[PDB]
């Protein structure tokens, strides 16, 4: 129940 | 030896922007994998040429039987592909969201496999893996964790050499990333925390839609304890998620070590865990090598430029 994240960089 | 052409595409199993992951059976061989296929340009285009060779690298170099391995690496006229291994119980983050918690031998379990895994990457590896959350935690068909994705770790990071990479999942970045501070593997059990949290508590330790309310919370406030947390993993979330990573548990030259004799992983036999003597608390209910039931149908019902200089590998 929280919604799917996003991976990333500065 | 490997094309496009040596593999049969059957089900859509993920979709970020750079690319796709979908289940493959080798002709060859009669084997499924999973494949990860990047478009070329997309990655020229989104800056993530660096990112991908780390993945690349830290695949081929890597044997840990936590560890998604590599078979073969190859590139088209516009594509990168990554066969690896089929984790066929697909994501953490699918079962914590049907089960709401897991019990604690459950966390506590998976929890051993991924610290047997951090260990190795960090004092064989020399690698800091960066980006621990529950979409990059898989199960196998027996229920023994596999770590996927692998674009965000640091290489060369040896004992407690520092790095500045702003970097991983905003839910997940550690107070030192926040701070905009130089910081070492301890990271990964800052990563590890919230994990285990996630696990036993049924939610992240911060939460705010907005990033910068949520990294507020992260650098500001003291995690809260549900009362039906155990005095054991109370005391090991507290020590995870200590902000100061010179004072969090794994954060000294021990490193894992420090996390393996935590009163919390009382009677875990290290060397049984990777050896994967350990019984799974969830065997994955699977009816043949293809059954994508684990993942979720948004992806499964879904109907199917430079050259990289020695990308392409096999492992045999
Ligand atoms: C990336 C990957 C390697 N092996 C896999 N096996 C099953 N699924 C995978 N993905 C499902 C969506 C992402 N979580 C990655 C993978
Ligand atoms: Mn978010």
């Given at each position: 129940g929280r919604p799917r994240t996003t991976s990333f960089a500065e | 030896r490997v094309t496009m052409n040596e593999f049969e595409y059957l089900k859509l199993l993920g979709k970020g922007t750079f690319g796709k992951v979908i289940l493959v059976k080798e002709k060859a061989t009669g084997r499924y994998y999973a494949m990860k296929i990047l478009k070329k340009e997309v990655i020229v285009a989104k800056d993530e040429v660096a990112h991908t060779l780390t993945e690349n690298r830290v695949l081929q170099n890597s044997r840990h039987p936590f560890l998604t391995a590599l078979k073969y690496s190859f590139q088209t006229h516009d594509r990168l592909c990554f066969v690896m291994e089929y984790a066929?119980?697909?994501?953490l983050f699918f079962h914590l969201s049907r089960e709401r918690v897991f019990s604690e031998d459950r966390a506590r379990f998976y929890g051993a496999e991924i610290v047997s895994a951090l260990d190795y990457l960090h004092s064989?590896?020399?690698?800091?893996?960066?980006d621990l959350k529950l979409e990059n935690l898989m199960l196998d068909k027996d229920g023994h964790i596999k770590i996927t994705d692998f674009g965000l770790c640091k290489e060369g990071?040896?004992?407690?050499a520092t790095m500045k990479t702003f970097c991983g999942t905003p839910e997940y970045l550690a107070p030192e990333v926040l701070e905009d501070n130089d910081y070492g593997r301890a990271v990964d059990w800052w990563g590890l925390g919230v994990v285990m949290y996630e696990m036993m508590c049924?939610?992240?330790?911060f939460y705010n839609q907005d990033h910068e309310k949520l990294f507020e919370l992260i650098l500001m406030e003291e995690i809260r304890f549900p009362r039906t947390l155990g005095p054991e993993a109370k005391s090991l979330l507290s020590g995870l998620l200590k902000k100061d990573p010179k004072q969090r548990?794994?954060?000294?030259?021990?490193d894992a070590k420090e996390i393996m004799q935590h009163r919390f992983f009382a009677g875990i036999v290290w060397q049984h865990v990777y050896e994967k003597?350990?019984?799974?608390?969830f065997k994955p209910q699977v009816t043949?090598?293809?059954?994508?039931?684990?993942?979720?149908?948004?992806?499964?019902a879904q109907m199917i430029r430079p050259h990289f200089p020695q990308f392409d590998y096999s492992a045999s």
């Open positions: - | 066929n119980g697909g994501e064989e590896k020399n690698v800091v893996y960066r990071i040896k004992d407690g049924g939610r992240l330790p548990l794994g954060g000294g030259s021990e003597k350990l019984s799974p608390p043949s090598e293809t059954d994508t039931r684990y993942f979720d149908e948004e992806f499964t």
